[PDB]
């Protein structure tokens, strides 16, 4: 039933991708 480890691991992947694509300065 509780095989949500995949979501837990995919959460890490999505964090890593968000850090790679991040642009520091942002305005308006």
Partner 1 sequence: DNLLDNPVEFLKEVRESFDIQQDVDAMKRIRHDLDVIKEESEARLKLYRSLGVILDLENDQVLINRKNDGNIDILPLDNNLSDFYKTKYIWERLG
Partner 2 sequence: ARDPRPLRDKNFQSAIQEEIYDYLKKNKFDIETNHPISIKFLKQPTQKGFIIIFKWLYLRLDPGYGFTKSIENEIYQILKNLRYPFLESINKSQISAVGGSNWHKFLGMLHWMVRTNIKLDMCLNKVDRSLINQNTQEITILSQPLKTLDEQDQRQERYELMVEKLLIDYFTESYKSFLKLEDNYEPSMQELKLGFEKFVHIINTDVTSTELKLEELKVDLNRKRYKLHQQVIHVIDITSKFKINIQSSLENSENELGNVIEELRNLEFE
Angle at 21 between CA 15 and CA 27, to 5 degrees: 110
Q: Fill in the per-residue mask, 1 to 28: x = in contact with partner 2 (CB under 8 A), - = not in contact.
A: ----x---x--xx-xx--x---------
Q: How far apart are CA 28 and CA 9, in angstroms?
A: 33
Binding-site member from 7, 8, 20, 26 for partner 1 (CB under 8 A): 20
Binding-site member from 4, 7, 11, 17 for partner 1 (CB under 8 A): 17
| CB nearer partner 1, residue 3 or residue 25 | 3
């Amino acid at each position: 039933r509780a095989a949500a480890v995949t979501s837990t691991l995919k959460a890490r992947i999505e964090k890593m991708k968000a850090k790679s694509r991040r642009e520091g300065t942002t305005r308006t």
